[PDB]
Every structure is written in structure tokens, then in C-alpha cells.
DNA sequence: AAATTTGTTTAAATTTTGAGCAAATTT
DNA sequence: AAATTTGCTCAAAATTTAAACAAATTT
């Protein structure tokens, strides 16, 4: 009912799913922790940069280096998918 | 003296080890094990909307906490974000954030 | 009362898209 | 040897941008 979802433990060793959105809220409550009113400045490029590297990672994986077939599985471009492909470097 | 804080170490996630213990790990491996867990439920539908759908769960919570920082002022949320104020109200918009 | 933010528009800059081609690669 | 993908170009379509500025708000 929720399709991404990564694997929590709990004092109990009972493994249960949470959504991957309750990561990112954690992360940056905790980012944020850390910062004493020191100013951020590119936040959204920073965790698009921290998004986009296993995604593309993993989408190149599951589509065995075919560019043609990833770009159609993401719903972009074939040529966005270069672009972002050689702005992390992999390629 | 400053020790080196990789990029993948700025946004960690509390994590139980092998050995029981605590550790902080990069939001980098969340995005790759709720992907690799998405993948094993598509044996084999297709799929043809996978940044959209990554982005809007990334998005939502990141604008979420922003707001929250910033006391739901616009301005210094789009500033912080590095974003045009517009393209921020526009993202609001779209997860229903005003 | 002053400083700031909001809500909105308008136009330029930027980025994404689609389409189309030969050369390379997989099948 | 056929079929598909790569690498690369152009354009237009779509989106992000900054720059207003009056009205609403917060300091």
C-alpha cells in the first residue's frame, strides 16, 4: 500500500517495514541537530544529490547498463539520464 | 583540529548492527535497500514513473521538516533550500503544504 | 511605525523533451 | 543479418528564475 519501504528493527528483533519519507525526515532532523543556526545554503541540490546517486545505481543495475530501458523505467529523457549520469560520474 | 565529514555522512540514519550496537549510517544506503526491496515486489511488472515517485518521497518530507525550521517562512525556507521562492510554493502546492 | 514576507505577474534563462541519424553493440 | 542502443545533434516545450511591487504580517 506503500511502495518505498526500508526495514526497521526493534527491541524485540522484530523486523517491520517504515517508509523511506520517515529516513529522510530522520536524517534531517538530525542535520538540522547538529547546525547551531549555522546557515545551510543548497539544501535541496545536497539530498538531490544524496537521492538521485543510488537511484541511478540501482536502475542501471536492474537494467543491466541499458540507458534506453533505464530512462524509460525512471520516466525521463534518455538524454537527462546521460546529463545526470556524468554529473555523479558514472559512465 | 577538523575531522573530514564525507558528503554520504552529512545525512545519516540510526542503524542496528551485526553486534546489537548503534550506528549512523548514509541516507544513500536507505534510498538503495527501499530500491531494492521496490525491485523484488516487480517480479516483473514494468514500471515508467520511478524519479517522479523517488522525488515526491523525498520532497515532501524535506519541505515538511524546512517549514517546520524555518516557522513557515517562505522566504528563508527557499533561501535554505537554494531554491526560487516561486518553485517552493510550488512544490508546497503540490503536496498540499499551505 | 519599520522591516519583512506574501502573493502575484511578467520575461528571460535554463533545463527537459522528442525526434532523428550513423555508428556501435547485442541479440 | 536484424534489432536495439548509443552518442550526438537540433528545436520546442516546459520549468525555473529574478525582478518587480502592493497588500498583509511580524518584528
Redesign the pocket.
Known amino acids: 500500500s506503500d511502495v518505498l519501504t526500508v526495514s526497521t528493527v526493534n527491541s524485540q528483533d522484530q523486523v517491520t517495514q517504515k517508509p523511506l519519507r520517515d529516513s529522510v525526515k530522520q536524517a534531517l532532523k538530525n542535520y538540522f541537530a547538529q547546525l547551531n543556526g549555522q546557515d545551510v545554503n543548497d539544501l535541496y541540490e545536497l539530498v538531490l544529490a544524496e537521492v538521485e546517486q543510488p537511484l541511478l545505481d540501482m536502475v542501471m543495475q536492474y537494467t543491466?547498463?541499458?540507458?534506453?530501458?533505464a530512462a524509460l523505467m525512471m520516466?525521463?529523457?534518455?538524454?537527462?539520464l546521460?546529463?545526470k549520469l556524468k554529473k555523479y560520474g558514472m559512465?
Not at 543491466?64 to 530501458?69: E, F, I, L
Not at 520516466?75 to 537527462?80: Q, S, V
Request: aromatic content about 0%; charged content about 35%; overall charge positive.
Open positions: 543491466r547498463g541499458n540507458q534506453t530501458r520516466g525521463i529523457n534518455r538524454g537527462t546521460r546529463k559512465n
